[model samples]
Target chain A: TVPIVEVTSSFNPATFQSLLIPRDNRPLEVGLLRKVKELLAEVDARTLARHVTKVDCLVARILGVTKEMQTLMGVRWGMELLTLPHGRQLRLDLLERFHTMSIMLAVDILGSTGSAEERAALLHKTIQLAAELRGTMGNMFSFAAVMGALDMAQISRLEQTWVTLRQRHTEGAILYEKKLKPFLKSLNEGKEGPPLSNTTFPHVLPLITLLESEHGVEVVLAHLEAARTVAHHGGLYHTNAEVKLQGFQARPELLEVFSTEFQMRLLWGSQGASSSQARRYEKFDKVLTALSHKLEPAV
Target chain B: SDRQLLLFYLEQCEANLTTLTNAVDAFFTAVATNQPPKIFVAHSKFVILSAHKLVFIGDTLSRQAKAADVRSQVTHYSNLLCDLLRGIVATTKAAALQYPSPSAAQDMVERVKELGHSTQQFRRVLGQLAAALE
Candidate 1:
């Protein structure tokens, strides 16, 4: 292999500040081409805003509908899959499908980046986003999805990328391994603090499973009734997300792109290359694996 | 190597147990009420899904695992679990067809309850297997 010598670049606050204060105090000229470039940047920013807002709007709709459907559904629906109303069944299925898409997106974002530092930054930002999902957004489903993505063998095997995070972004590393991991476990295990009444999102799906699945545990009616309150809480939660969803205006082209990305069949970098689910999963996994090794080669 | 190998199969068996338990619980809850035929229809599908996963685990257990004793324990557990899940699927459909008729459907409930009890016993046996391996 050829020695891969490349330009090494990094910008901290101090270094970035110096770059802003140009090497020469000469006045810059705005040639015709320069003018076009400047205008392109402005248009690019607006384009990005359109895309971001449209995607956000789509996510909110799914989030709201998920909660609302959970509210409308009987707790029996979660346990006894047969007792699930068709409306609620499709809604739950969509949430789960979306979770898979979310993981693909997380892996795609990190794997697409060129450098370890870039991957680390994206991973760090993703952890922060996961926290927001679990906290302010009150969307534990998405939070768990993001966490699952990070915990994937393909992502976790990127030893150097993780090293970068640990060395450069220690706080994120700590948040991921220490705080977030434990909290998610506790929430899933039904041991998290406070009763369901006081809590906003206690990751209801797993809780339902734990409550219903245990053969040894005799779940009293009071316990079942207590679980029912989560559905009521979801109604309120859905309303809030619905309100936010209404506030953002959608761009049709961007909406289509975002929709296609979240489609159940599609995976990052797959681009409809494979028809079968396992094939697509394997294909995309290999892609991520190669990308991870490229970013930080295995010893 | 045997320890990790057994642990992997053990983990799969444990998770499979959870799915079986959930499916059984769902079936019991559904039949307890005198509801629509659609409920049983859906419940049958749920049982089908559970059985499919259980078959996969059992097939994997049969093929893999070097230790004959550990493998046999898991295989035995898997066979029993699959039988229970399959019984639920078949009985659920038949019971749904004979709905509101106490004679046939009532017998099915007793059989289902017995399977649920056996599942609990298998769960205990699974734990014993875990303890033995440990």
Candidate 2:
């Protein structure tokens, strides 16, 4: 088993420079602050019952940190490409190519990696932190959001193996949802406690709905095809050695279908401009999906 | 004249209001300025807890006042502040929904703006309550 070495990159900044201007410009309100303080300070059962809310806050904070890192990397990478000799035009074309292949690789890698014990641990911790912030009621949505974010990232990487990995993760997520269904059902059945009126768990429901949707399976298959096309055409490695290494490691032929599936997923609910826009072009979607379905299925 | 006692109560209320405002402000600022939202969350928790305490104190003083009018004024301000803080929990949930997507940064900005509006409204209402006694 290859030990997963932590990749260290010196791209992160100590602080974000954006000025924080509130919608309102007013001094602190002590009275309101006091109530919040009491809520946090209280270690009794009421606060404990609300532990999931706190966990959600913690998870959101962590995800915020991750987003910042990804943004900074993107900026840095783009800047580096711009500085080369006669680089402007070439880099532009190269970026376009890279984007195409990168998406494929991300999907493939996600499918190949799937949900291992390590990923499960990451998911559990992420959910736990969200739970700690918001209480069980609110934390569920936060957990779902994180999973959605992971889906976005995985689709973006587009590795050949990602198809398999995504299937597993999707399956794993469904299973996880299934386990919670009984608990949720009991809540509905008025078995354990008083029957809550609203759906206390917001995030999990949408995720489960997405998983059970036809579009969800379609997106997964599309990604597999997209990756395969990029691999077969040998057009995946027109850039640098790093791209080549990542591409070869990904087995691009396996992911040609990913592009289409990904586009469908984006249409369903996935946001983030780059991923969303890429999926909108019908020609591109059709090309990727058509090729992916044509490839040998990973059994 | 109960000027001295009223002044004392007013001062306490003002001080508590300031703390609550600062906490809410700091939390929004942290979100808008791309500072850690945790800082705002922690501050918010502090403000609400502190305000709850002050409200208790104000309640006690209001009970002691001889003039019903003065007592009503103080109680009104205290209650208003308490309600505002309670409202924060709900507002924060709205803020949470705006995050976790590509639009998060934009959402944070919108939320901070809303916070600013809420703070001003709260301040005006408190000011009216305080002035009624004078």
Candidate 3:
């Protein structure tokens, strides 16, 4: 076992800031690289089928689009950022599915705590699912979700689970460590902001909410020329005009989750809030936890 | 643990994004289709309240917004609330233009299409951030 540990270097996230998909239209099966199939297949997929389904549903939903982005000038111009200017709603749907799949898959894995090899099989299913989401779908939303779930304290605490993952499938293990880990790592570089790996605006959800997604998303002279005409239009507000949406489950929170200036960086490091970013995230995480417990603890 | 919560709220935002967009769209679509704004009026009432809540969240986030890009995204997104409200109000512009004035209807639809173009930025990053932090 000690000799096998020497087969791979330790995981380092500092240099991993890169995107999983360089090409938007690439096929998913090719990205799987045959290695994972060859090695990880030792375990029966029956145990992992549920997690696979979680990802399948996510990919299926993501493929469903409101409007296909036709290009203009240089950017994917079809997406509007505001209503009165708005991007397509399906983009949000994909992201949400990404989030839902990530947590549910992980929570299920965490909840299914068992023997070492038994647990490794469950977590591997999630990793496999995440790879498909990124490699096959060109959707980082689910990719990030799977990776996030893996990093959870409860999940990460599974040293034997992970060691077993490494020891079981050498071909798959190398593929996971060398290929997958770096892309995931690139997402979390401290001094750097999130990775904007897509060349085109509106291509994919950036690793962070960088306004550089496209010129159209930002208010520039082109849109302003058109919007100015609407600006000439009169007031629609009734001093206290209320904007109402339907249902209770829908409108629980008033604030949009992230804004340009600040995001609740709820990533409390193993170090216990080492920096300001950690501290801020720590605060936001607390509230988010409290709220989710009320809403859907099972997830 | 915190990453889960952050992702959870993001999930909520993503989940409700469609509902929010649909509510906002219905109001404008009514004006575009020459339908009475009765449905729009009801939807707008909920949205305005939602906007108020977003503003409150934005204010809370802005307190430490300078610290993290998420807060900034939170505010940037929150500011979308105003633009969204303006959009519902913008529906009023063509109200007099015969609801779906050929050119004006096209213009409004184009505007909605454009505004909705880049919705996935924050969710993408937040998801990664959650993954990375651990």
Question: Which of the predicted structures, 2 or 3, would earn the higher TM-score when compared with the native?
Answer: 3
- Interface DockQ of each model: 0.02, 0.01, 0.02
Give the per-residue lDDT digits (tens) of candidate 2, residues A118-173: 33433433333333322333333433333333334333233342343345456544
Model 3 spans > 4 angstroms off: A1-85, A88-95, A186-203, A207-299, B1-134
Q: What local lDDT does model 1 show for residue B8?
A: 48
Q: Give each prediction's root-mean-square deviation over alpha carbons.
A: 21.5, 24.9, 24.0
Q: Which 10 residues in a row give candidate 3 chain B its minimum summed lDDT?
A: B56-65
Interface C-alpha RMSD per candidate, 1 decimal: 17.4, 28.7, 16.9
lDDT of each residue in B27-95, candidate 2, tens digit only: 656665654434544554544443444444444445445677767865675565555555554454444
In order of TM-score, best first, we have: 1, 3, 2
lDDT of 1 by residue, B17-84 (tens): 67667776786677767555577456545544544343333434444456678677666765676565
Given the true complex, what DockQ would model 2 score?
Answer: 0.01
Most DockQ-accurate candidate = 1
Candidate 1 off by > 4 Å: A1-92, A193-227, A243-274, B1-134
TM-score of chain A of 2: 0.22
User: Distance from true position, residue B84, model 2, in Å?
Assistant: 1.4
Q: In order, how many clashes per candidate?
A: 0, 103, 52
